């Protein structure tokens with residue numbers, strides 16, 4: 001599952017946690033991120049990274065931390081990732097080096113770190129001993145999400161009946177009823193910037209038994225002009241001596257969910 005490197009590969013990896021109320025209010029969110037650098041050719045070992053000048057490297061809310069061998073100074077003044085010791089070069093063993101980390105915490109009702117909103121509507125059902133559930137979602141991502149997995153923490157006896165007419169992605173399917181994990185429903189696609197819903201009926205003792213519901217999703221692009229969800233990105237890669245001398249590179253921009261849930 002490790003992506004292919006043609007010389008310099010820069011991975012920008014962000015992970016998002018979030019907690020919503022049943023009615024859709026954001027209680028909290030926390031985003032962690034890291035910039036990893038992989039190089040496999042000694043010709044390119046002796047290089048520097050220029051972050052997009054779109055980025056405020058002094059924003060206190062991002063809590064930016066640089067690897068202890070990176071030059072804090074050049075980073076802070078020039079948005080430049082380079083080694084303190086200008087005589088040394090980066091490892092050329094194709095191994096991931098984390099050169100920069102960041103973390104952002106948003107308080108209740110701040111929706112700036114939320115790629116996917118969530119709300120639930122829940123009534124007792126006719127057809128089963130339990131509940132009719134609708135989960136409304138809305139993406140604000142510019143790419144589309146694939147194989148999104150909603151998990152309810154119950155193990156019912158009768159199987160789940162997905163209301164395919166009242167849902168948006170009609171071919172949603174259950175993919176797991178364990179006892180340990182509970183019941184997990186998968187969705188093919190969530191379209192960029194589009195709202196949707198997932199509707200179904202499920203067996204359960206009482207309403208609180210359905211929560212917390214967890215969502216799980218993931219997204220990746222290899223585009224060289226890619227921005228992260230928080231606007232993180234590379235301007236250029238550049239010779240450690242001749243700063244006008246550009247070098248070639250690829251960049252992967254990921255965003256995975258971790259503890260993303262409705263409670």
Ligand SMILES: [Ca+2]
Nearest residue numbers: 234235236237
């Ligand atoms: Ca450029």
